[PDB]
């Protein structure tokens, strides 16, 4: 029932918006395809499109369904279904293809570096496809580096956002350089004024990283089994003042990870103008306070595409 061989790819281009994937500048990856459907395609037939195995259409939301192809008027041409495992859309055809002949359709699908696939900086040959007909381009994946100010060093990104429960998750690397940090204090804040909400209840788990361990340059951990959960240690070390939590690390030599899930407030305009920040403080030689800080904010792609047909007489 797969009718891939019946599909005529007129165009297919992978772009990166230079061939550099700034995954931490929220750089997208276009795949702008066009094609022709022959009339020998009937209701219930299936053509495919697959993404590269190392991308994902949505970075921080599991809600990555494929769009559906729709004629100018709005009648549906096919409804797609995305399988994360195989990273492949399967587009089933509606009765449009029976009512209509000579059918030309365009797509444009954005995607992000799958942080589970590619935990560290590297080059990749990306391979995309439209109905089996592959195309490729080479790229390199740069991950952000931490801010350093004396001993104070930190970095962070957004990992998972839940449009349903209105929460957002941020993962913070306190002391990725495993420096000796004296009276270390780490703040998390809605930011720099406010966009989210941080208080007693905002979930903050803390993990210690042994000196032999190296963290994923993606800045997204997937497995916390293999890190010392120290969250209870920080029980008696939490100050909360004006959308700002403050953590008292004391003198440290070890890296740490913080997992912050925080409620956000929806924007009336109906876009996701969300942002959150952290900052690491350490006393320096001269007895001053050095602040390195990090702030993340959400970026949005959105697939687009339609079709068109002769009306059969």
């Amino acid at each position: 029932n797969n009718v891939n061989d019946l599909i005529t790819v007129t165009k297919q281009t992978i772009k990166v918006g230079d061939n550099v994937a700034a995954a931490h500048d929220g750089k997208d990856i276009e795949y702008d395809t066009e094609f022709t459907i022959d009339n020998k395609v009937k209701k219930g037939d299936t053509m495919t499109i697959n993404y590269d195995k190392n991308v994902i259409p949505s970075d921080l939301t599991d809600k990555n369904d494929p769009i559906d192809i729709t004629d100018p008027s709005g009648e549906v041409i096919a409804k797609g279904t995305f399988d994360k495992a195989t990273k492949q859309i399967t587009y089933t055809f509606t009765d449009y293809v029976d009512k209509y002949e000579d059918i030309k359709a365009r797509l444009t699908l954005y995607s992000y570096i799958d942080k589970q696939a590619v935990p560290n900086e590297t080059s990749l040959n990306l391979t995309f496809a439209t109905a089996g007909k592959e195309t490729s381009q080479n790229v390199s994946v740069d991950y952000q580096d931490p801010m350093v100010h004396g001993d104070s060093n930190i970095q962070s990104i957004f990992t998972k956002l839940d449009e349903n429960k209105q929460t957002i998750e941020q993962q913070i690397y306190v002391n990725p350089l495993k420096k000796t940090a004296t009276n270390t204090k780490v703040d998390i804040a809605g930011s720099g004024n406010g966009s989210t909400i941080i208080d007693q209840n905002t979930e903050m788990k803390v993990y210690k990283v042994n000196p032999n361990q190296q963290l994923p340059q993606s800045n997204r951990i997937y497995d916390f089994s293999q890190y010392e959960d120290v969250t209870s240690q920080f029980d008696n070390k939490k100050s909360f003042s004006n959308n700002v939590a403050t953590l008292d690390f004391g003198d440290i030599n070890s890296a740490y990870i913080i997992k912050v899930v925080s409620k956000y407030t929806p924007t009336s305009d109906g876009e996701l103008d969300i942002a959150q920040g952290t900052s690491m403080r350490t006393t320096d030689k001269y007895g001053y306070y050095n602040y390195a800080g990090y702030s993340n904010f959400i970026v949005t792609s959105n697939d687009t595409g339609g079709g068109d047909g002769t009306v059969k007489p």
Binding site: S58, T61, I157, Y289, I298, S301
Partner: peptide, 17 residues
Amino acid sequence: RLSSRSHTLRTTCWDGK
């Protein structure tokens, strides 16, 4: 259809006197 960005800000804080 959704991903993050990162930004950096540094200051120092001493005592005026």
